[PDB]
Amino acid sequence: VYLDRKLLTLEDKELGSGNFGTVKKGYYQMKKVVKTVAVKILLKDELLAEANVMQQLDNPYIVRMIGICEAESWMLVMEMAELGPLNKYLQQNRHVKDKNIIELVHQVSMGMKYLEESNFVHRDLAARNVLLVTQHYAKISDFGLSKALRADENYYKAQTHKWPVKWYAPECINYYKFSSKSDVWSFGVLMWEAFSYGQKPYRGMKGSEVTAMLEKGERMGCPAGCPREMYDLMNLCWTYDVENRPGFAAVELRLRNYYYDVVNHH
Numbered sequence: 001v002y003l004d005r006k007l008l009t010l011e012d013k014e015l016g017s018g019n020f021g022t023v024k025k026g027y028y029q030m031k032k033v034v035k036t037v038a039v040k041i042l043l044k045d046e047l048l049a050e051a052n053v054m055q056q057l058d059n060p061y062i063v064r065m066i067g068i069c070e071a072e073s074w075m076l077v078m079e080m081a082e083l084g085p086l087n088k089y090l091q092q093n094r095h096v097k098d099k100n101i102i103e104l105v106h107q108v109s110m111g112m113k114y115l116e117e118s119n120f121v122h123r124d125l126a127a128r129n130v131l132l133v134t135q136h137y138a139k140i141s142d143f144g145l146s147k148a149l150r151a152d153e154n155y156y157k158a159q160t161h162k163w164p165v166k167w168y169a170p171e172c173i174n175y176y177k178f179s180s181k182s183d184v185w186s187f188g189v190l191m192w193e194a195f196s197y198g199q200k201p202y203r204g205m206k207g208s209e210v211t212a213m214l215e216k217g218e219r220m221g222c223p224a225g226c227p228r229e230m231y232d233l234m235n236l237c238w239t240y241d242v243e244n245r246p247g248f249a250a251v252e253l254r255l256r257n258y259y260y261d262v263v264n265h266h
């Protein structure tokens, strides 16, 4: 959990930045090998809560935390996913095949099926928060808004609203209620982003105009080259009523079966 700063070597140039601070590449000295790491460098309570969520998770499709370090700044040290965010990768590699996109979004659904089984809500599931280990291996990152659900409740109730509204289900916006089914809605938006090679969803629209569009029963169109089966799955994730929206066990199964059909056709 608490890492030794003497064993961490940070690179000078950052990989990326945000309002939180920076993400830098580093190296952590192990009992024998060196481990390449991604380090989120800073607020403190939020980073510690994010670290506490990551320490409880154990799944091949979720970013693994090595530990935290309290040195010049507070640091969250994670296993490195070298290829970076999925949205940026697809913007820069617009000839990635449709079968490969299905493979990656199916990996995300497996990580989310595990989070749902673990009763954690992600609350920020978007293509910018998926990282690539390789072109054929995605991991979910960014547990800063994540919550462990109480034993007696199926949702987390936020007290007041900095929210990624274009990824949020109607019950999040209207009742401040976040469940695994709310993450399924975000997963539908993530699928649209991935099949659109990292394009932003609801292009040119304000959050209130997105709410108005969804309330009229309107949904984003089918991205170019996206198979009908995958657009149908996106629309099922965007089921307005939480009760009738599928959970990640059903979503992952649909994706798994379609992925095997495409692997067979190829």
Ligand SMILES: Cc1nn2cc1CN(C)CCOCCNC(=O)c1cn(C)c3ccc(cc13)Nc1nccc-2n1
Pocket (backbone or CB within 6 Å): 015, 016, 017, 018, 023, 038, 040, 063, 078, 079, 080, 081, 082, 083, 084, 085, 128, 129, 131, 141, 142, 143
């Ligand atoms: C919370 C968290 N973890 N993290 C990143 C975040 C932060 N998220 C993504 C939200 C903010 O994104 C904007 C900042 N941009 C980048 O992080 C990255 C940019 N390039 C080119 C990368 C290459 C590898 C990589 C990360 C990045 N690798 C990695 N591997 C493991 C974890 C990690 N990044």
